[PDB]
């Protein structure tokens, strides 16, 4: 409905519930959050708004399971839209975050 502002809001609300452990998180970011909403710039962020985003990644997402990481990678290869290594995915997120942030302050 091209109500991209509110679309983001509902997805965030669902993720905040701590019943997701690390693989019902891997699925969401590659399907929705990263390709649709953070590859496109259209949002003004600031130092704190970026920080909070830093909090979510560091605490609750990353694969600790060896099978989960190897599986995410095969899936990434078949359908490419996100950096293949996930320590290069750390880098790529930070850069998009920093664009949003810069644009508010200029």
């Amino acid at each position: 409905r091209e109500d991209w502002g509110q679309a983001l809001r509902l997805l965030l609300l669902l993720i905040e519930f701590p019943y997701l452990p690390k693989h019902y998180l891997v699925l969401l970011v590659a399907k929705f959050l990263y390709p649709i909403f953070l590859l496109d710039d259209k949002k003004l962020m600031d130092e704190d708004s970026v920080a909070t985003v830093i909090e979510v990644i560091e605490t609750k997402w990353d694969d600790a399971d060896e099978k989960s990481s190897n599986l995410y990678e095969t899936i990434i290869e078949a359908d490419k839209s996100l950096p293949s290594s996930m320590a290069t995915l750390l880098k790529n997120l930070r850069k998009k975050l920093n664009f949003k942030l810069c644009q508010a302050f200029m």
Partner: protein
Amino acid sequence: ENVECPFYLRHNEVQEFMFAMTLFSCGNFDQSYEIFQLHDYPEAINDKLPTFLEDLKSENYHGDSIWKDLLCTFTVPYRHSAFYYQLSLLFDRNNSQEFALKCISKSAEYSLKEIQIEELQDFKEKQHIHYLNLLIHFRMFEEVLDVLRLGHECLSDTVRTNFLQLLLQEDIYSRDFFSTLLRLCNAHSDNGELYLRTVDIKIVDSILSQNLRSGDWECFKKLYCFRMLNKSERAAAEVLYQYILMQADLDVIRKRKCYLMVINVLSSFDSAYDQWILNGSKVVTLTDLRDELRGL
């Protein structure tokens, strides 16, 4: 109405000058500009001109005249450039900055050609200064940037320091200017370059530290975004880090936010010498930084 319109002699020296001023004082600055575009007089009619204007061409007239200054540029060997400049000065003074802005663009085109024609350096500075003012007045800040930048053989870098200081240090100007500059950096950041040269970068970088004086977040954020866009990110984190340290009147929640950004930026670098920020002269590790957020 009575003189310069029934008795316009077309491409005659006398009726061209008389008309051209008369329209100008009647506030038709567009029509005056049209007349100099029907002949650029230093070439078309050369520098021979009437006895009473000759007095103006020199300093042998002692009354009221601002057009005096326009006759003066028929003595100089950079005569095309000087002429148009004088027209720029004239328009700006009677408040018709649009038409001044037209004149100095031609004046500048003329100055660049006239570098194989002998043209004084002191002249050049003042002429280019006049151009920057017009652009600043309408706030067309993109063009201000080009003229300084490519114009290092036109000005001294110190006069340039003042101009960037003026827009950086004046609040009337600072938000609108900073935004125009940083947009252009971002476009070029993408491309593999910097929009600015390294000489320009340090002049600005210096101008923004004057602000800092007792910490203060706003001072820091301006120097932080500056560092961020020139891909000086490691150094951008050092500026963040100081906000934390320099103030002990910050809330725990304020501190925690800064640490997170400093932690994340170094951890996205994966090297052996970009895993630290410098605090003074003391090496502060990524491990020590994380412990500092954990200690909160």
